[PDB]
């Protein structure tokens, strides 16, 4: 994969996913996020994995959509979710994450979203944020990982708690809770059974089978 590629594609009316490539532990990996139309504005879910990529994303949005990103949510503290928050903040975007994500990002020395998202501290908590629903399923890929649902389009953004179908073994589990991860996926399945399009943090999107597949991989690990 070539490094530093940033692009986006439309899933539904007013719903896009952005895709970036970045070097991680020496190799090039893809990384997904979400863009959701919020009236005359856009809500951004997750950075494009780095300052340079995220500045490129903001220009790509002007080329393809032409509406201003006014708010951004990071779904956990890893650099592929918050790397670029400083670029967003300087561009005039209000950046958000849960208190736990903000705390864990600070510990790592990663960039720190400005605003705390209240109402997501207990597994099963769900809150509306502009045109999306934010959901804390419980610990999985990280203790703080959030998932995002678009009620108007039945799009489920699982973030890095959800794996793509081609993955057959667990990935990075340094920050994960393997004992809780299957239960947390079960909460997602129970709360969003009508999802028609499911996006992993890395790799190809698909249907709801990505949830059960992720459980399978996690349990077989282990
Ligand atoms: O889930 C994975 O194993 C995975 C797959 C593709 C790309 C990435 C991952 C993953 O866990 N990443 C990542 C990025 C920043 C920091 C970390 C950490 F902190 F877990 F090492 C992991 C990047
Ligand atoms: Zn991560
Ligand atoms: Zn990730």
Author numbering: 39 to 260
The study reports:
VIM-2 is a clinically important representative of the class B1 MBLs (which also includes the imipenemase (IMP)-1, and New Delhi MBL (NDM)-1), that have a broad-spectrum substrate profile that includes penicillins, cephamycins, cephalosporins, oxacephamycins, and carbapenems. The combined biophysical analyses reveal 3-oxoisoindoline-4-carboxylate derivatives as a new class of MBL inhibitor, which do not, at least with the analysed compounds, strongly chelate the active site zinc ions.
As revealed by subsequent crystallographic analyses of VIM-2 complexes, 30 and 17 have similar binding modes. A structural water molecule, W3, also observed in other crystal structures of VIM-2,12,18–20 is positioned to form hydrogen-bonding interactions with His196 (2.9 Å), Tyr224 (2.7 Å), and Asn233 (2.7 Å) and appears to be important to the binding of the carboxylate groups of 16 and 17. As revealed by analysis of the Cambridge Structural Database, zinc–ligand coordination bond lengths are generally less than 2.5 Å,30 thus 16 and 17 both do not directly chelate the VIM-2 active site zinc ions. Notably, for 16 and 17, which displayed the most potent VIM-2 inhibition (IC50 values of 10.6 μM and 32.8 μM, respectively), we observed binding to both the di-Zn(ii) VIM-2 and apo-VIM-2 protein by 1H CPMG NMR analyses.
